[PDB]
Amino acid sequence: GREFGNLTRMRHVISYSLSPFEQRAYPHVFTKGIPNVLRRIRESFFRVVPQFVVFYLIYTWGTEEFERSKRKNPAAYENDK
Amino acid sequence: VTRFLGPRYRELVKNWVPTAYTWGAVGAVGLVWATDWRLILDWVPYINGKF
Amino acid sequence: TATFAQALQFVPETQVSLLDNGLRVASEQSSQPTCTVGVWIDVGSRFETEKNNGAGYFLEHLAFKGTKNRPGSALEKEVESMGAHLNAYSTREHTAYYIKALSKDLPKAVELLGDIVQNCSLEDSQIEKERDVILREMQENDASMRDVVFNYLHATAFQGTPLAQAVEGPSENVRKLSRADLTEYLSTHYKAPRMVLAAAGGVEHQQLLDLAQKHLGGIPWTYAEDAVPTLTPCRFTGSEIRHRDDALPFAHVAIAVEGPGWASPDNVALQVANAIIGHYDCTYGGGVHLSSPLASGAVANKLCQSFQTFSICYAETGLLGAHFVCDRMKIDDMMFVLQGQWMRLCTSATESEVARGKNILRNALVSHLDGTTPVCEDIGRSLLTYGRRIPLAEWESRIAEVDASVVREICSKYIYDQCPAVAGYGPIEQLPDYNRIRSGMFWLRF
Amino acid sequence: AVSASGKWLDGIRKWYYNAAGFNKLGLMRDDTIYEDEDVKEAIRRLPENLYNDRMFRIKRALDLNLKHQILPKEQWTKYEEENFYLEPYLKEVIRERKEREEWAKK
Amino acid sequence: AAATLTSKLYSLLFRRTSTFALTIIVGVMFFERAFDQGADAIYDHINEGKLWKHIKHKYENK
Amino acid sequence: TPMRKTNPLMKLINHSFIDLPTPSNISAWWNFGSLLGACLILQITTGLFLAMHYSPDASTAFSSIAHITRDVNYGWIIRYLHANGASMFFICLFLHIGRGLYYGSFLYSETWNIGIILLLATMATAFMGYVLPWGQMSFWGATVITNLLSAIPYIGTDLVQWIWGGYSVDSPTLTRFFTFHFILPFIIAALATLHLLFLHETGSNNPLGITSHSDKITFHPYYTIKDALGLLLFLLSLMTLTLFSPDLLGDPDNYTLANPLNTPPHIKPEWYFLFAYTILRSVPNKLGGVLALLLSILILAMIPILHMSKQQSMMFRPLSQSLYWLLAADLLILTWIGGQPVSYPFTIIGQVASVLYFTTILILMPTISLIENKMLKW
Ligand SMILES: CCCCCCCCCCCCCCCCC[C@@H](O)O[C@H](CO[C@H](O)CCCCCCCCCCCCCCC)COP(=O)(O)OCC[N+](C)(C)C
Ligand code: HEM
Ligand code: HEM
Missing domain, CATH: 3.30.830.10 (Metalloenzyme, LuxS/M16 peptidase-like)
Structure with a gap:
């Protein structure tokens, strides 16, 4: 019972439109599109990236630490004797 | 969650206690029979076709 | 005072x-x-x-x-x-x-x-x-x-x-x-x-x-x-009558189980149970989810148009039960609520609801007796069966004795897993076949 | 119960208020609230013009979300601009539910 | 006016469906053993001298 | 009087596809759900043509696959589309679940739970299917995974041998796994039908989290071509994974025959299971590692209970969003740790990553949700 006639009541919200054939597929791309994608990415940055950077840090540190203990292990035999 | 505790809910749970132990007996004995559990079935007086 | x-x-x-x-x-x-x-x-x-x-x-x-x-x-x-x-x-x-x-x-x-x-x-x-x-x-x-x-x-x-x-x-x-x-x-x-x-x-x-x-x-x-025309014992039956006639605005169902004779204690507790199931009419502003739980079911998705719970009694035998008007499309649903209420009193009977029922029953027994005609009819009808007049103080003494365990005990004694008698004057088709009702008389959880 | 630190609380609440993105879409605070049945009945009780303003602002938000755009900076909702219209009604509804429940546990 | 056994049996076991399922399960508990040993005894009885378990006497327990 | 409204099959298609309202502002993430629906078909069709040559005996399971990759015409493309196809299946799956966790889609609790059960089904399917090729990692993975069942305290080994069909992994276990692997995906399909069944009586969620009844739109004109583009990009990424770098998501050693005797070094399970495997590596106890493992996936069921915010989507609640991406980074951490041999650096990072993985969503999220509640003055 949720057909389009059954949905929410709403009152005088007039809406305008155009035929797809009456308008080009890529309006104002260079002037309005790219800056929009840019503000989007700029909103996304600090909320997303830095924690991944922390992943890069823990990754490189873990690799350097394993590789360090492994190859300094004979070096640990060296300081041993 | 806090709302569920109360003066009448104690009464209700108490009303359904015998049913709870009875179905618990149903599940227990039913499990013991479905599994042919050997441990308790060694103790039962007549059900000893198991060797 | x-x-x-x-x-x-x-x-x-x-x-x-x-x-x-x-x-x-x-x-x-x-x-x-x-x-x-x-x-x-x-x-x-x-x-x-x-x-x-x-x-x-x-x-x-x-x-x-x-x-x-x-x-x-x-x-x-x-x-x-x-x-x-x-x-x-x-x-x-x-x-x-x-x-x-x-x-x-x-x-x-x-x-x-x-x-x-x-x-x-x-x-x-x-x-x-x-x-x-x-x-x-x-x-x-x-x-x-x-x-x-x-x-x-x-x-x-x-x-x-x-x-x-x-x-x-x-x-x-x-x-x-x-x-x-x-x-x-x-x-x-x-x-x-x-x-x-x-x-x-x-x-x-x-x-x-x-x-x-x-x-x-x-x-x-x-x-x-x-x-001498001696009175004779009366058998009860679990049958049903199902007159139809679809042109009527409403189905008018009435269901009833066997009840205690006019002169037995149990009736008193039963009255309290009837106070719990509660009579109702949609003309009232007291409806919606308010009032009786059967009425709360009667008006939520809007079920029963009007109904009443009755306990007709004769010597030796009687009829506990319920009676409801209904729309053609809802005749089943109102049943599902009704029997459920019975089942609720057959098992989980909380004390406060029993208290409310006792107060309603007391208020009923007192309110009935105002005026001269009701008390004359009272003295007459009471002398014809009980003897005595069974005084109101004795009534409250016998009502106060009632307890939720007694209610569930007697209601289990007469309602639970018993065979219903059904009378449905139509239109009727959605009303459950008698096996659905008889199986509707008991839970598989209890 | 803090004084000037409470003004500091007003400051951090303002900053967090600007951290939430609904200002970018013109939404009032109350539009964003999750609509469970209590909120549903709370919306049902709204006066017609207010309910209309709510439904339209919701459409404007969804429409802006369609084209992934943003409401112009002049038109953004301001922290002092908001009217907390839905609170009294929702509080009435919730209080009624708590009343029915407290009666129901007894 | 003597009471039928079912009048008390229903009043005890059958009145509640949980006890009903319980007595059913115990009934399965006994019926499985009894019926199985019975059918085994019968099938063992029809064909005496054929089954090897009865032929074990030529070589069993030293 | 359109015919769609008349014939019942056309009625159901008129519901599920052509006419059902959807929020207009639905983004690219919801598309992944439909993509999963697509992937299953591929995983059937492609897989259906691998079963026509595969022999589930232990003595010939490997040589039969050599028969497929070599002797059969165009068999190798089917092989690689199948194997990479499972990987794309779990990628779309993880993105799908992340989408459902992010936008507060878990409030549809029944749909959520059916999704969880279907998840466990797909996991078992992928496992038994990975066991089918009968290489080194396949045989060894089976032995290691199966033993976990042995963990259960009383029943244990009788049950484990009941899975093996013998003392040890061998041909009957392989045949059994071939059967269950054959049968499970269709059950996954019926569950998916249940899934969409529960889903549609309320309608799809929208990113804002506000109800979209004011702006509902028919599915056919728009989302069919949107999902056509998403399916096309899916086939693009899949074909690029298959025709250029077939191997990198896979693991060398499977091309060697299974040895009951000899034991392979790195012994790493295929990547989608890796994080879970790390948890086994994390808890020293056997049964404790098993329970932590089962909790690793069950835990999703507890999320709706743990919800505290008076809003759905994280997008209006940046702090919880930051916790969310911390959670994703943590999953990357476990997923990377699963590829590594036990050593001082790894064991410590694995334990901390696991404990953080449990604490961030059993403690921190509800609390910061309450903080976000108090910051907005209600
Ligand atoms: C390949 C095909 C497979 C199917 C094979 C079909 C075989 C044919 C037989 C099947 C149907 C036979 C009909 C049996 C009688 C009908 C059952 C019904 O009548 O029972 C009702 C109720 O159903 C059961 O009796 C309820 C008790 C259930 C007991 C459960 C025992 C344990 C079962 C555990 C199985 C769980 C699945 C585990 C699988 C691994 C009783 O109705 P009623 O008498 O009017 O009301 C109850 C009266 N009281 C008040 C006395 C109680
Ligand atoms: C969601 C559904 C499915 C998924 C995710 C899936 C995944 C997998 C995976 C990961 C493998 C391992 C192959 C490798 O790594 O080399 C595999 C192999 C296999 N799959 Fe599937 N599968 C699915 C459904 C099916 C279906 C429906 C069939 C029907 C025939 C099937 C048949 C096979 C066969 C026969 C193999 C082994 C043959 C070979 O690997 O050469 N699978 N599958
Ligand atoms: C093969 C696996 C799956 C298939 C085919 C599938 C199918 C679908 C489809 C077609 C939709 C329609 C909306 C959309 O596509 O976004 C959907 C929505 C949804 N799915 Fe899945 N699903 C799968 C797995 C899962 C899993 C694993 C979960 C959760 C852990 C899940 C939870 C949900 C939820 C909560 C929605 C509601 C979307 C909304 O509210 O907007 N699904 N699913």
């Missing part, structure tokens, strides 16, 4: 004199000019054979159209001259007549009863008139619901039992009744000690006693040929 314990005691005790012929005089003193006087005969529709089913009702129509002592029109002229409002009825178990007049007029009424019961001329023209009158009355009351559906409920519940047939009697029968059959019915039924004179109100007792002896002292207490 206001308090229960004293107020129960201020209500006067009812004196019960015994005439030598066995007629039971009774009275309840009060300080008001008005008083009602009546004779609640023990005779009812239960006693007639199929040969004479319509006798008591028909005589109920012409008990006072005429009489041997005075012309009937002169009689009604006299009662109208007194300002009195004589009235009568005839239940399946209890015939009754009564007057409604000033204490100043009290003696004049009493002897009138001593006419109406003892002797009434039965002119064949009058009876012949009452014939077509009743025949058209048969065309009258059919239009009404409720009473029709209860009549199917009795025909269902009892079938071969004498109790099963309606008070009005078959239409085929009523045109066939003869005056001789009526004199037979009169000679074989209306007499002491079945009779019980009663006059609650302003009536002083001793005057009622003297007036009782003088006129009502003449009633014979001996049956001819010792042909």
Whole structure:
């Protein structure tokens, strides 16, 4: 019972439109599109990236630490004797 | 969650206690029979076709 | 000031004199000019054979159209001259007549009863008139619901039992009744000690006693040929009647389980249970989710249009149950709620709901007894079965004794896993087949 | 119960208020609230013009979300601009539910 | 006016469905053993001298 | 009077596809759900043509696959589309679940739970299917995974041998796994039908989290071509994974025959299971590692109970968003740790990553949700 006639009541919200054939597929791309994608990415940055950077840090540190203990292990035999 | 505790809910749970132990007996004995559990079935007086 | 314990005691005790012929005089003193006087005969529709089913009702129509002592029109002229409002009825178990007049007029009424019961001329023209009158009355009351559906409920519940047939009697029968059959019915039924004179109100007792002896002292207490019509035990059945007729605006279902006889303790607790299931009507602003849980179900997605929970009772046997009007599309759903309520009292009965039910029941038993007519009918109907009058203080003493465990115990005793009797006057199709109902009488969880 | 630190609380609440993105879409605070049945009945009780303003602002938000755009900076909702219209009604509804429940546990 | 055994049996075991399922399960508990040993005894009885378990006597327990 | 409204099959298609309202502002993430619906078909169809040559005996399971990759015409493309196809299946799956966790889609609790059960089904399917090739990692993975069942305290080994069909992994176990692997995906399909069944009586959620009844739109005109583009990009990424770098998501050693005797070094399970495997590596106890493992996936069921915010989507609640991406980074941490041999650096990071994985969503999220509640003055 949720057909389009059954949905929410709403009152005088007039809406305008155009035929797809009456308008080009890529309006104002260079002037309005790219800056929009840019503000989007700029909103996304600090909320997303830095924690991944922390992943890069823990990754490189873990690799350097394993590789360090492994190859300094004979070096640990060296300081041993 | 806090709302569920109360003066009448104690009464209700108490009303359904015998049913709870009875179905618990149903599940227990039913499990013991479905599994042919050997441990308790060694103790039962007549059900000893198991060797 | 206001308090229960004293107020129960201020209500006067009812004196019960015994005439030598066995007629039971009774009275309840009060300080008001008005008083009602009546004779609640023990005779009812239960006693007639199929040969004479319509006798008591028909005589109920012409008990006072005429009489041997005075012309009937002169009689009604006299009662109208007194300002009195004589009235009568005839239940399946209890015939009754009564007057409604000033204490100043009290003696004049009493002897009138001593006419109406003892002797009434039965002119064949009058009876012949009452014939077509009743025949058209048969065309009258059919239009009404409720009473029709209860009549199917009795025909269902009892079938071969004498109790099963309606008070009005078959239409085929009523045109066939003869005056001789009526004199037979009169000679074989209306007499002491079945009779019980009663006059609650302003009536002083001793005057009622003297007036009782003088006129009502003449009633014979001996049956001819010792042909005593002993009452008989009544079997109950789990069957159903399902009249349809789809053109009606509403289905009008009535369901009932076997109940305790008129004189057993259990009924009291049952009354409390009926207070819990709760009667309701959609005309009220008290509906919605409010009021009775069955009413809360009646109005949420909007189910029952109007309904009532009833506990009809006779000697030995009775009928607990429920009754509801319904739309065609919802007839099943209202059932699912109803039985569930029963089941809820058959298992999980919380104390507070029982308390509310006890308060509603007390309020009912007290509110019923205001006025002179209700207490006269009370003294009569109570003397006809219980004996005594079973005083209100004893009622609250017996109601206070009720507890949720007692409620669940008795309701399990009579409701749980019992076979329902069903009477459904239509339109009907969504109403569950009887196996669905019978299986609806018990949970698999409990 | 803090004083000037409470003004500091007003400051951090303002900053967090600007951290939430609904100002970019013109929404009032109450539009954003999750609509469970209590909120449903709370919306049902709204005066017609207010309910209309709510439904339209919701459409404007969804429409802006369609084209992944943003309401112009002049038109953004301001922290002092908001009217907390839905609170009294929702509080009435919730209080009624708590009343029915407290009665129901007894 | 003597009571039927079912009048008490229903009043005890069958009145509640949980006890009903319980007595059913115990009934299965006994019926499995009894019926199995019975059918085994019968099938063992029809064909005496055929089954090898009865032929074990030529070589069993030393 | 359109015919769609008349014929019942056309009625159901008119519901599920052509006419059902959807929020207009639905983004690219919801598309992944439909993509999963697509992937299953591929995983059937492609897989259906691998079963026509595969022999589930232990003595010939490997040589039969050599028969497929070599002797059969165009068999290798089917092989690689199948193997990479499972990987794309779990990628779309993880993105799908992340989408459902982010936008507060878990409030549809029944749909959520059916999604969880369907998840466990797909996991078992991928496991038994990975066991089918009968290489080194396949055989060894089976032995290691199966033993976990042995963990259960009383029943244990009888149950484990009941899975093996013998003392040890062998041909009957391989045949059984071939059967269950054959049968499970269709059950996954019926569950998916249940899934969409529960889903549609309320309608799809929208990114804002506000109800979209004011702006509902028919599915056919728009989302069919949107999902056509998403399916096309899906086939693009899949074909690029198959025709250029077939191997990198896979693991060398499977091309060697299984040895009951010899034991392979790195012993790493295929990547989608890796994080869970790390948890086994994390808890020293056997049964404790098993329970932590089962909690690793069950835990999703507890999320709706743990919800505290008076809003759905994280997008209006940046702090919880930051916790969310911390959670994703943590999953990357476990997923990377699963590829590594036990050593000092790894064991410590694995334990900390696991404990953080449990604490961030059993403690921190509800609390910061309450903080976000108090910051907005209600
Ligand atoms: C390949 C095909 C497979 C199917 C094979 C079909 C075989 C044919 C037989 C199947 C149907 C036979 C009909 C059996 C009788 C009908 C059952 C029904 O009548 O029982 C009702 C109720 O159903 C059961 O009796 C309820 C008790 C359930 C007991 C469960 C025992 C344990 C079962 C555990 C199985 C769980 C699945 C585990 C699988 C691994 C009783 O109704 P009723 O008498 O009017 O009301 C109850 C009256 N009270 C008040 C006395 C209780
Ligand atoms: C969601 C559904 C499915 C998924 C995710 C899936 C995944 C997998 C995976 C990961 C493998 C391992 C192959 C490798 O790593 O080399 C595999 C192999 C296999 N799959 Fe599926 N599968 C699915 C459904 C099916 C279906 C429906 C069939 C029907 C025939 C099937 C048949 C096979 C066969 C026969 C193999 C082994 C043959 C070979 O690897 O050469 N699978 N599958
Ligand atoms: C093969 C696996 C699956 C298939 C085919 C599938 C199918 C679908 C489809 C077609 C939709 C329609 C909306 C959309 O596509 O975004 C959907 C929505 C949804 N799915 Fe899945 N699903 C799968 C797995 C899962 C899993 C694993 C979960 C959760 C852990 C899940 C939870 C949900 C939820 C909560 C929605 C509601 C979307 C909304 O509210 O907007 N699904 N699913």
